[PDB]
Design a protein around this ligand. Structure first.
Ligand code: GTP
Ligand code: GTP
Ligand code: GTP
Ligand code: GTP
Ligand code: CA
Ligand code: CA
Ligand code: CA
Ligand code: CA
Ligand code: K
Ligand code: K
Ligand code: K
Ligand code: K
Ligand code: NA
Ligand code: NA
Ligand code: NA
Ligand code: NA
Lengths: 253, 252, 253, 250
């Protein structure tokens, strides 16, 4: 099963406006830099982080322990104007996992309590022998159908419509959905089958007239899972699979 | 008149898979760093940049001339595994400006044409006497209603539902809408008035049960307009004004 | 006339140790990231920053005004766990200029005074019509004589021996010397001539058995001057010039 | 036994000037960003990296295996306009470890050969039971004596004289010396004793009238060693040790 870490900037709202408001262009840089660092440092141990709302983030951390989490927390404290709290939870589905993690976080106190800083806890347990399933979803021919033909903002609008439709659809399976740039989305989705995605894609195509494909990788860590998902997408592209979904499992054991 | 610059990574799609696919954690760090650098560099000249789709970005660039754009483009080439193209356009409304800018980019060639490297052009003209209006929009008490109450993913889904509702609504006015983190959004909106915002807001409250406020800053550059809009949010919070919208202008 | 800005991290020593000492990998990353941002941001206005001691940094800022300095200071304030002080001076020579700017800074108070935050002042005046001369200095064939032949640490020693020799020689002409990487050095050096450089290079060769070359650029900004120095170095390499120094000056027409 | 990794930007020289020379402010940002990333990424595994010459860096990597090295190399390739080669070696002294790693790197080819990309090798062995010793050297009262008294460049000058003097001294013991900012230096110094530094420190004071102190830390990784060296410096400052050197072990 899947281990997930929820990450929150401590008491961030008061900081951003106290003693005055702060240049937005600096806060964008500050926020992206945090995100970039978190992916390098969790990435160093085969994790993956999605940006979510920026002041709150979700990470798949199968195989990353409590001491490693503490050292990443300590690195942020030494180089940033703020601290971060982190709670870990495991569960059979991604949605179960983050819900438990968030519950324990909230038990410690408000996201705006100056006394509440650098929480670091495990809600139930760390995953000893589990797995992550990631589906890497992509639009067929975004460049010829949107990027090169309609405005920058209309492509962005259209991609945000598909994104929300996919979020509502996937939530029925306790699966999560995150934008990763371009026309690309990743869905932590332990428990879903290929036939589940083919259903969702039929509905998205009927509503929005957009064609979707996905590689599904299953592995021991987020890194392994997403690498296998990338190969699936190439297989589909090189027409060495019939359909718009492809599953690959890790077996280099 | 607002000036918009559209920014595109040249031939980005083929690079991410040639010779092979690349670890996604690396691609996230790369994309985020490019976004951060663009805000520092355009910010150094009082511009502002929205992440948009990460391989395509929209910036407000009133007051930033062609040679500065070129300098910024050179800096990315010297430091990244790829290049970027940029086209500038002016117009009365934000929507029109980026439309004009995209159209000229498209005349030069495809987003995935390896011989279309480093376009740098002006679709019509650079703004010499213009202004920027930015509305900075925020949800009331996100902490007490959602962040401290429901799961992380549930607050994320709800904020994204509000985001798309606001994108649809604002487009009738030829305004744009971008997420900037937590419960905040920014809307380049030359043409709109306080009453246009108050109208959109109670429709959103009726539908989603969330209450919004907004500071409207009007200035000569993205930075001035965004700075003023931030002050309007503080006036609403401090009860120095009695409605959920507040306009401040550079020469008040 | 050359314009120099001295930049100093306010009350830095106490911060690195309060409440405890901080992990050194984190301070190296923080310090390097600050120096990079100052080059991007001053660079965006055609300036150039040298890392100097990291908590104290020296920059050439001809053509960059007081408001722009303030905006850069503010950006650091919004994204880092400390603030920075800056003082600007202009003078006929680099050594004079930074000496004046340092003295004004010192009048405001101590490097470890917690109530001395975000100094920003000019010591005399901002250069109105002035110029920058930069010499870009480099060792002939580092790769064949040292990099590919001797240990990593042995090239590092020899490169540092030459660095100190140049520092001391150049000081007699009121010029500065900073290491920019590899086997490369930059010398702001308003007042010096090609012959002065050939005289220094002669002594260094005789003493260390290493051969030096330099392009000298003269321009209105640090970017103009240092781009021109770069071209000079390529001309020496391409034997378009018959000596180990080459001067190029800015001509917009 | 100390384990050292030498890191080199492949064929960097031709890249900086082809097809044209590149703006210097950009190259400074690029090189500093690379240095910073390398410390976060090796740091995430309890290593430490010193900038050295920027195109050539030296790292202490006790406990960091070959697979972790390969993945860091891959991260750089995915995000920079260039690639890096890395060779690892162990030995009793820092100086000999870096020497053996370099010779092996040189066996693969020139630092300016385009076909020699992303070398990754071990010269002898990865250290299983080793230790690192790091002395963290600092100048007593730089602020009152130099920073607040003389010009920016004058203090920079004196700190660089002390730096070269220490490099040459420490090399007699096969120890390395790196500037880390301010008035601070680190010396991987496996072998040396407190009295060894006390002799070096006497000579530097007699020649330059600069008074030095050092916390010395002995641990199983670079991170452990330098954290203990930091505690050492604080004991000296807190006057709860007698002299100007101070050792803590893990
Ligand atoms: N995060 C992320 N973005 C990607 C990845 N691969 C491609 N992209 C993005 O996808 C965009 C469009 O590229 P493609 O998907 O290859 O183009 P396409 O036009 O849709 O062609 P096909 O998808 O092959 O039908 C690029 O500009 C990138 O932004 C990836 O692995 N990760
Ligand atoms: N991008 C950006 N985000 C901000 C800014 N100010 C606040 N935020 C975000 O807003 C989040 C929530 O803080 P607040 O809006 O102050 O919290 P609230 O509970 O909604 O309080 P009120 O809006 O005053 O009722 C923070 O965690 C930040 O992520 C800003 O200026 N720019
Ligand atoms: N900071 C900086 N470093 C440079 C620049 N150009 C080259 N270098 C560095 O110089 C190092 C050695 O490259 P070269 O100078 O071409 O090598 P060389 O072997 O000395 O060859 P020649 O000088 O042509 O004889 C590279 O690895 C870079 O680190 C530059 O413009 N700025
Ligand atoms: N890299 C690095 N630099 C440090 C560290 N601690 C302090 N510094 C630097 O040292 C500079 C001067 O501060 P101190 O060394 O505490 O000041 P001092 O005036 O010499 O005081 P004493 O050392 O107590 O005699 C700071 O500005 C920092 O650059 C550290 O742990 N690592
Ligand atoms: Ca696609
Ligand atoms: Ca709010
Ligand atoms: Ca050379
Ligand atoms: Ca000291
Ligand atoms: K703001
Ligand atoms: K990928
Ligand atoms: K330290
Ligand atoms: K250069
Ligand atoms: Na794609
Ligand atoms: Na907010
Ligand atoms: Na060189
Ligand atoms: Na110090």
């Amino acid at each position: 099963m899947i281990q997930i870490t929820v990450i929150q900037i401590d008491n961030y709202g008061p900081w951003t406006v106290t003693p005055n408001p702060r240049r937005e262009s600096d806060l964008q840089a500050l926020q992206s830099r945090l995100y970039a660092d978190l992916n390098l440092m969790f990435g160093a141990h085969k994790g993956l982080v999605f940006y979510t709302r920026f002041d709150n983030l979700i990470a798949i951390t199968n195989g990353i322990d409590l001491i490693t989490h503490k050292r990443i927390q300590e690195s942020i404290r030494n180089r940033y104007p703020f601290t971060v709290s982190m709670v870990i939870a495991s569960a059979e589905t991604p949605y179960e996992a983050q819900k438990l993690a968030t519950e324990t976080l909230q038990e410690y106190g408000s996201a705006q309590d100056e006394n509440r800083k650098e929480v670091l806890d495990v809600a139930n347990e760390l995953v000893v022998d589990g797995y992550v399933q990631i589906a890497h979803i992509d639009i067929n021919n975004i460049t010829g159908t949107l990027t090169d033909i309609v405005s920058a903002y209309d492509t962005y609008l259209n991609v945000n419509k598909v994104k929300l439709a996919l979020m509502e659809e996937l939530l029925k399976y306790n699966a999560l959905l995150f934008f990763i740039g371009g026309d690309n989305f990743m869905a932590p989705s332990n428990g879903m089958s290929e036939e589940d995605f083919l259903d969702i894609f039929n509905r998205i195509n009927k509503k929005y007239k957009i064609e979707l494909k996905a590689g599904i990788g299953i592995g021991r860590t987020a890194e392994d899972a997403s690498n296998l998902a990338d190969i699936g997408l190439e297989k589909i592209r090189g027409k060495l699979v019939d359909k718009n979904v492809c599953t690959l499992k890790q077996d280099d054991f």
